[PDB]
């Protein structure tokens, strides 16, 4: 069907979302060359579950969701079926039977700043784990103790979103990684 999938709007976007407010775009009814994308030198992870990456060529009759966001390098492992941790539990959860692809690349050149980039946030606390592909963008004070919070920080009442550091001198595990997750809709 000749019309090219606009994957550049996803991968080459200049802004990426915070992981708690992860971005979802629809790609559908288009053709691509998956190897232009797969062979990119920047990527360090390009993993496909229950699908071959060649299935990204022929999207002529298929709807794909592209989810994107920034996390720390040592958290990329959590963007996978069956994982636990702050990111899988409280920010972005894949289902146990995920079929799709997970792509990640070190973005220190883009997303770190000399004094520290504090723009990217993650959710540190939640009363229960996220369901698959659930988004929680609430900003209510998290009550960790027995005293009600009344809307402001307290001794054990915490604002639930925390900023990543992203200092360009961070170890690689602490550097920012951009992540794209590709999955199918019906």
């Amino acid at each position: 069907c000749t019309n090219l999938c606009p994957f550049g709007e996803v991968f080459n976007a200049t802004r990426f979302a915070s992981v708690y407010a992860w971005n979802r775009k629809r790609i559908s009814n288009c053709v691509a060359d998956y190897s232009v994308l797969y062979n990119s030198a920047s990527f360090s992870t390009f993993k496909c579950y229950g699908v071959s990456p060649t299935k990204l060529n022929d999207l002529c009759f298929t709807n794909v969701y592209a989810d994107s966001f920034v996390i720390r390098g040592d958290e990329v492992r959590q963007i996978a079926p069956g994982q636990t941790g702050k990111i899988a539990d409280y920010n972005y959860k894949l289902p146990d039977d995920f079929t799709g692809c997970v792509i990640a690349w070190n973005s220190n050149n883009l997303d770190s700043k000399v004094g520290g980039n504090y723009n990217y946030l993650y959710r540190l606390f939640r009363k229960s784990n996220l369901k698959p592909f659930e988004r929680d963008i609430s900003t209510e004070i998290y009550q960790a103790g027995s005293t009600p919070c009344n809307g402001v920080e307290g001794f054990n009442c915490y604002f639930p979103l925390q900023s990543y550091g992203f200092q360009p001198t961070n170890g690689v595990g602490y550097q920012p990684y951009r992540v794209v997750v590709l999955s199918f809709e019906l």
């Binding site: 407010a21 971005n23 979802r24 629809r26 969701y65």
Partner: peptide, 12 residues
């Protein structure tokens, strides 16, 4: 729709 595109919800 629980799984809609976001923040650009106008695309579905």
């Amino acid at each position: 729709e629980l799984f809609c595109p976001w923040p650009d919800i106008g695309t579905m």
